[PDB]
Amino acid sequence: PEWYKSAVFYELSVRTFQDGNGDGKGDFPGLTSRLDYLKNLGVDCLWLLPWFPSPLRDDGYDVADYRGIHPDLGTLDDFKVFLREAHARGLWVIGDLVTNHTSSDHPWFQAARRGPTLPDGSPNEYHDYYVWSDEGKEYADTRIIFTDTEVSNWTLDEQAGKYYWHRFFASQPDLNYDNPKVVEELHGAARFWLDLGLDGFRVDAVPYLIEREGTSCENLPETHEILKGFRAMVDREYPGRLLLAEAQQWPEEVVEYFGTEAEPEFHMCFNFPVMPRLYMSLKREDTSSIREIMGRLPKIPSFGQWCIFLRNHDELTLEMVTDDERAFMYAAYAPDARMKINVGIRRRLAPLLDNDRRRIELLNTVLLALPGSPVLYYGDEIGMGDDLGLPDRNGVRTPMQWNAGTSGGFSTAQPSDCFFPPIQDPVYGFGRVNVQSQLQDPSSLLKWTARQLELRRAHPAFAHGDLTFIETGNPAILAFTRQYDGETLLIVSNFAGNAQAGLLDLAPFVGRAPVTLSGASPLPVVTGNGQYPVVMGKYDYYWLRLNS
Amino acid sequence: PEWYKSAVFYELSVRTFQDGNGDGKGDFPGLTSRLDYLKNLGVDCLWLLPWFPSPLRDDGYDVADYRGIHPDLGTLDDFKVFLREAHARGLWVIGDLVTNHTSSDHPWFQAARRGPTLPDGSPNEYHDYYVWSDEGKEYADTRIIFTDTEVSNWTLDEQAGKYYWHRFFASQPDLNYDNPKVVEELHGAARFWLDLGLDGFRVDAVPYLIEREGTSCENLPETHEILKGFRAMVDREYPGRLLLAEAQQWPEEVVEYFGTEAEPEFHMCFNFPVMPRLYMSLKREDTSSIREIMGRLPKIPSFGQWCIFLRNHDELTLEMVTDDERAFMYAAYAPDARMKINVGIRRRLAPLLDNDRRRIELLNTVLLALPGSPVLYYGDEIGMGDDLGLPDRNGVRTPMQWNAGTSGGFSTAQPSDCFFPPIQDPVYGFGRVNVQSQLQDPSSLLKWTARQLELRRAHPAFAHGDLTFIETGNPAILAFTRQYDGETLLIVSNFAGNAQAGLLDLAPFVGRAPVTLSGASPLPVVTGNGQYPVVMGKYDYYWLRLNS
């Protein structure tokens, strides 16, 4: 198989990971020094958050140059060395490619806002790089995404004298993909980094490329035709490189972003459908939404692979769930009204789960045993907290916590001078929650995560096998099998806070013994009708093999 | 029933819990300010380590005045306030009565060492307070307890020109109980504190009072005679007080320290038998040695109650295990030569268990679930570690860790000026392990412990009910029932590090429905022959009721 199907991904922001020089900002020398850490964790692929020049109004998804490195993070020489050094360790790196839009500080938009013709009468070729309107009445009734901050997707530019389209902040004017010059600019921006050795891109906000009257302005066929073109460009010029899509859509529209065997689009897509249902199931002590949504996902192409995750740099999004499912989630997980943003929740993993390590391990085992390639968010592997006193999703992006020294060892600069202030509270602070502490602890969450990744690495059915849910007779107990190359795994997970009793339909496996993956302990052989009774403690996870 | 059968005891050292006046030593006004912590923990009775004047060559078990208060700890008035404020909070208090020996600095031994007669001719009434020998050849080949320090149990005193007996330190000479004045002295001391409102005594080293030639000098019938007289005095003069025996002996001999219904001795004994078998069983994933040692414990009198503990202020002792059990416990629980002392391991409870919270919770539930009244060792409810730099057994007596402020909140003095230096290491140091942290932490070990005691409190059968071991067909799984007042609790626990299955013999309970004490989650009803299958995750504990 291709590499990305077997890979464990780790998402980090280069600005908040390791400061190498005391300026209070993470940089690429700093990241390079921590590469043995990520390797020893069992990570196979970094995914770097946007590293480009930018005024950082959206923390860098507002690109003011696609072919350079933000000064904060170092130089392009530093980047190249980091890339050389990760490859020397068998690490893959994928960047973030921001296609839909650019910063209003981009030179293109600085040109385009001057009018259709320049002060010397010649046409201004940059003007059609963006999406203009005389009055701003086109594409009405389409969703606003930053519902908390923006009142419209049209904002008047007082210089150019007319409106311009943006799905995100006013400072992020959308690019005009009906202009063929724009498509080739992003082909070329992609080409620039793939030539440098980068192994692929997470492409960002793909559903919103093209805008058409009379539609939702999402998942448009024309948009998919642009992405089919990216994949052709990459597959032709850079074999082996990965294209990963962020598609916050319902399952039927999400599988579209894989394309098909004839016309491929993305290699990999983020399984947003399942993610919120893992948290609803934990509070509802009931797993049936997981199976429901999981069966609403069609078979994807051979080249395709789901990308499972629990949290990320963003809010826990609640926009692709029902009105009932959403109200429940808010009540379960957003007691303070401040914890809500943009139809979602802005909390780190550990606070969501009340810091309960039994619950943290449960979800992460379901993360690693579900079909796809997992992606860890930076610092979740040690149980970091959030800082809601930071605006707009920034409270989950606080600096990594390496040790209990100055600023958590993220930087020699005092925490007040760190780009984001490292957390120092009594529950989640760096004096209590840090990597050094947990490397010396025999039983730390860090070492648990590494032990668990190693256990999954040993059983290729986790990455490549099929998935079949099993009847348990109890909505709190989720059970399924993964089948691959004549290994059958049995994953039985309790989602309740107390002991639960199941009855598993192991009819097809009569005369087989389930044995533990850990420690090889025999459980009774499946007999008779195949109905197999189990008791499970609170939040237990049984990782089992069915011998032949 | 007697109050102590309901009680939960907490074992603390006043020098070490909370300093009230910045001197670096804990005192009684410090302890008085922390009394609300203890009550809200769910603790009924305080056991204070010795608080008497003493040069502290054995941290206070070398007494220099039975009727005073060590200057470190405050005044006799400080003590009366504390006992008032403790009784006002529903807290019993028992002190440690060091009976077998005094300090060589005790007035008595200072007198006695002058010799049989005074310089002026008259006999020296104090000489025969201690045990003397002209040549130290008596009581030959008896055990030496402090094997690392003492080569003999006899020691030549320069001024008296002859040898004296000591079971413990040369600076802790044994008191001569064949002398009736010695008995009257200890009765007297007991009265002094029981007249101040103290609620009873731990009596220290009760097997070693009398020495008789041609015996082991342990558990002699003459020693029991004296202890009977103690019980008779307290029953007669101070009814309702508690007498607690620290008797590290085999099961056949420990039950003797209860006396008989006709002739009472102690109200309570420490279950030293079961203690090392708990740890042994964890590393072997095999619990037979626990059931076996318990099955050798004879029935005790009506008034009698076992005291179950996991750790305390002494090393984990292995004097009363076989020679092959001892060697096993050294390989498993003392990799470094520095962790042994005196036929035992000097480690705190969390380091012994590798700081694995699952194992820590498991053992604490078995503590609370076995017959008797449990005693917690201060700071194990938050996972304190040890400082093996410190000599003797001081590595388990570091100061309490209350917050992450100065010295862990123990003192306003610096760490280098505290009696024992508060632990500052990356794993267990007060930066990571402190009471303030765990009160704000929704899933801390402290909150688990208080919650786990509250559960026990609401099921009287743990304190009062009988014990019955259940066959599980799996050595890793320990099952037993507790019956009292028409409630039947069933306690299943997995001593293995991986999922285990068992086959319970619940045949006496056909038709009974098992539910969980927490939330009444239903398990299948017992039917047929009553062979009831279970599966368990690693280190699980099921606390079940068997509804009739």
Ligand SMILES: [Ca+2]
């Ligand atoms: Ca667009």
Ligand SMILES: [Ca+2]
């Ligand atoms: Ca003696």
Ligand SMILES: [Mg+2]
């Ligand atoms: Mg820097």
Ligand SMILES: [Mg+2]
């Ligand atoms: Mg003091």
